[PDB]
Amino acid sequence: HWGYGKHNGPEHWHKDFPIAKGERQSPVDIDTHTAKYDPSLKPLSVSYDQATSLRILNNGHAFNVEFDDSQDKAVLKGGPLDGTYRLIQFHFHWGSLDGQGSEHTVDKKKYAAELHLVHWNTKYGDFGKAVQQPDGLAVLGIFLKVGSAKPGLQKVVDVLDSIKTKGKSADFTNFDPRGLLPESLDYWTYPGSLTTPPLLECVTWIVLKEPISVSSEQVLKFRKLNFNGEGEPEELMVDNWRPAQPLKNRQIKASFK
Amino acid sequence: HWGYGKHNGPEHWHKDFPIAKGERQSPVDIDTHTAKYDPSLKPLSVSYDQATSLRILNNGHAFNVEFDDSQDKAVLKGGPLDGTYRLIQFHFHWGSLDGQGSEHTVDKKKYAAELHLVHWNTKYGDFGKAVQQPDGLAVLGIFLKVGSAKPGLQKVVDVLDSIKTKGKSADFTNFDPRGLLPESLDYWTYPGSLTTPPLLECVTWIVLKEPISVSSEQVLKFRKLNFNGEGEPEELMVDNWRPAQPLKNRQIKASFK
Numbered sequence A, B: 001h002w003g004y005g006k007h008n009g010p011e012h013w014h015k016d017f018p019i020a021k022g023e024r025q026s027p028v029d030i031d032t033h034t035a036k037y038d039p040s041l042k043p044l045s046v047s048y049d050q051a052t053s054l055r056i057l058n059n060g061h062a063f064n065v066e067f068d069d070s071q072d073k074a075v076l077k078g079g080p081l082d083g084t085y086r087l088i089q090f091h092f093h094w095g096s097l098d099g100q101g102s103e104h105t106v107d108k109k110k111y112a113a114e115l116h117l118v119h120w121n122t123k124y125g126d127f128g129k130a131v132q133q134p135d136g137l138a139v140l141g142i143f144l145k146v147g148s149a150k151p152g153l154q155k156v157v158d159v160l161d162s163i164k165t166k167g168k169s170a171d172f173t174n175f176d177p178r179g180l181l182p183e184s185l186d187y188w189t190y191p192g193s194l195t196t197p198p199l200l201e202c203v204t205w206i207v208l209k210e211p212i213s214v215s216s217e218q219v220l221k222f223r224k225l226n227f228n229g230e231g232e233p234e235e236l237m238v239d240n241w242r243p244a245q246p247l248k249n250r251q252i253k254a255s256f257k
């Protein structure tokens, strides 16, 4: 099974998931010299007021907060997107140290972590069908840096002891994903992939300019999760990020000047 | 994710897995009026003397006992097979009640459960390559009925509380799969598929005429496993069987009169 170790990590994924060497792999470095303002980009519309969180789970790679996606209760519209994209889950990638953790980079700067809000195009009926289409998914990416506590993160951090090991979950209701947003929704966009196997080239990436602050205490809780199952030797869940992949022919567009 | 429930069960698999309606799907009903004796069928050769069991796991569908398959320590030869097929794992399918559980049926009779010993053709180098070939796999199917205890099953039943939930596994060494066999190796054979997604049409089915007896105590322990993971509400692992699929143009051959 794939992971982030010496023998099963990003360098090895291509052996089991051939698309790992595809033409539209994520993440990428965002060079602010070439990622030019596009005045044709319509404003981004985030509609999270009625978001219904269901569960949180350790899947052995990250932790996922899952949402009720049977209705348009939490949707992304506008920006680069045609149609309605329903929030299915969010998760983070983070480092062993503050100087690393983000998948995307900005002028090669790595952040402490990266938040991925995962949405699928309602045009396709379910998530499984959406991942087979270039316009199937929209992932909202938000950078994390270490400073002040993020109050909206506290409810997540406070349940992580209940899902320390792989295959554990917990009921996780009334979580407001608006409390994880920065002030600006100014963004970069480019066509890309899932950053974990199966690495499918189905994602419109929307990466926010403005990082959120989390406390070193909040990021320390992330680093105390385990990759391993209960009863196995401890492997700390850290450095669960894929490095920058070749931009190849793609255009990164900025929503801002 | 696929399963055995109202919305994700065998009736619905075709929506996600088009091969579910393929030309060689398993299981099938074995009608003893049309499944005729074939005098050309060689005796079956089961060579399990050096079988090396490694681990047992709850994968959320059944429980698998895994074998060291790096050598010809546990192989199926003869009968309808060209070449050597290495034992990789066995698992069962079973019901909520004694009147159902088997995948294959004989003259429409369902048994309480069915054991699948899974082997792959050494011609193809590994299991992953073997599942892509029509002659890649050989599954030995054995029917379970409720009567006397199967002594050879007790070591399996005794470890099931330790793998109650999905993802759980345990060391499971020195298990002798010969202790799960009936006295007669008389069999039916036909070309078919995996009975679970991905339902690949890669299997020579060898189904034994003679069922084994298990105790009602032994089958009760099967019914106490969980489909769910740790932290989810209990869903009993019962009725993890696919019903009879259309025979279409296939010939079922009997090794016996």
Ligand SMILES: *C(=O)c1ccc(S(N)(=O)=O)cc1
Pocket: A026, A116, A118, A139, A193, A194, A195, A196, A197, A198, A203
């Ligand atoms: C699977 O549902 C999946 C895999 C990767 C990602 S990412 N890291 O590209 O946001 C999302 C979902």
Ligand SMILES: *C(=O)c1ccc(S(N)(=O)=O)cc1
Pocket: B116, B118, B139, B193, B194, B195, B196, B197, B203
């Ligand atoms: C997977 O390796 C797999 C799936 C199904 C079966 S079955 N039920 O056809 O014996 C065996 C192996």
Ligand SMILES: [Zn+2]
Pocket: A014, A015
């Ligand atoms: Zn290579």
Ligand SMILES: [Zn+2]
Pocket: A012, A015, A016
């Ligand atoms: Zn590999």
Ligand SMILES: [Zn+2]
Pocket: A031, A032, A033, A034, A107
């Ligand atoms: Zn530059």
Ligand SMILES: [Zn+2]
Pocket: A046, A047, A048, A049
């Ligand atoms: Zn709102």
Ligand SMILES: [Zn+2]
Pocket: A001, A059, A060, A061
């Ligand atoms: Zn995984």
Ligand SMILES: [Zn+2]
Pocket: A068, A069, A070
């Ligand atoms: Zn859903």
Ligand SMILES: [Zn+2]
Pocket: A091, A092, A093, A116, A195
């Ligand atoms: Zn991600």
Ligand SMILES: [Zn+2]
Pocket: A184, A186, A256
């Ligand atoms: Zn702005």
Ligand SMILES: [Zn+2]
Pocket: A230, B230
């Ligand atoms: Zn536990």
Ligand SMILES: [Zn+2]
Pocket: B014, B015
């Ligand atoms: Zn249908």
Ligand SMILES: [Zn+2]
Pocket: B012, B015, B016
């Ligand atoms: Zn489906």
Ligand SMILES: [Zn+2]
Pocket: A126, A128, A129, B015, B016
């Ligand atoms: Zn589907």
Ligand SMILES: [Zn+2]
Pocket: B031, B032, B033, B034
């Ligand atoms: Zn008949």
Ligand SMILES: [Zn+2]
Pocket: B001, B059, B060, B061
């Ligand atoms: Zn599964």
